[PDB]
Design a protein around this ligand. Structure first.
Ligand SMILES: [Ca+2]
Length: 223
């Protein structure tokens, strides 16, 4: 997260870190045994880390649970990043509490102008490289489809939306991938892509979660 703030320990209780020897992506806990992340975060040997603030220090509220399976969206295209969504099942159910909690799926899509919370352990520099140990947060509005398409001609599908600031300086970034965009207590987006980070006229692009609710529910129901 570039231009954000320190969230505070366990203030974003649905935020998970995906770890394969090291943090490589974010995710969102949507029930006791399932996480939603980006399809471009797919790999084998994933451990889901819940209850994290400082990802380098054991602080006492963590639960570390290996993934039993991952399910990348059947229509994910890694070139265009269309359908950039994946489900991860935990080997055992997380113990839910005030600091480890699921986030609700949308019942309807969020509109341009809606304020959302984006979070992660990604790079905090737009030019340099600096990875924080503690969770970073950014409040950012969803942008209009027209402004999103104008920013990224030929690249915005019906399964994507832009959020952030056309002026630059405030954005998600590398390492935030797969993490949540939560608006009015609903998971509306997944950190997917962007051209650099926090660059003028290049806002963050996010997977439009409301398009996948039926797939998520049906997949969970049979797996
Ligand atoms: Ca920790």
């Amino acid at each position: 997260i570039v231009g954000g703030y320190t969230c505070g320990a366990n203030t974003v209780p649905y935020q998970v870190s995906l770890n394969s020897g090291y943090h490589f992506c974010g995710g969102s806990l949507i029930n006791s045994q399932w996480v939603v992340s980006a399809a471009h975060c797919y790999k084998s040997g994933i451990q889901v880390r819940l209850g994290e603030d400082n990802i380098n220090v054991v602080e006492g509220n963590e639960q570390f649970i290996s993934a039993s399976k991952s399910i990348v969206h059947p229509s994910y295209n890694s070139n265009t990043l269309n359908n950039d969504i994946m489900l991860i099942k935990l080997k055992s159910a997380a113990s839910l509490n005030s600091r480890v909690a699921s986030i609700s799926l949308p019942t309807s899509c969020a509109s341009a102008g809606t304020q959302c919370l984006i979070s992660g352990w990604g790079n905090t520099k737009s030019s340099g490289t600096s990875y924080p140990d503690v969770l970073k947060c950014l409040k950012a509005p969803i942008l209009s489809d027209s402004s999103c398409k104008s920013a990224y001609p030929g690249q915005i599908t019906s399964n994507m939306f832009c959020a952030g600031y056309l002026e630059g300086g405030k954005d998600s970034c590398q390492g935030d991938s797969g993490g949540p965009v939560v608006c009015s207590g609903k998971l509306q987006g997944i950190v997917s892509w962007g051209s650099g980070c926090a660059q003028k006229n290049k806002p963050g692009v996010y997977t439009k979660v409301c398009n996948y609710v039926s797939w998520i529910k049906q997949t969970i129901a049979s797996n």
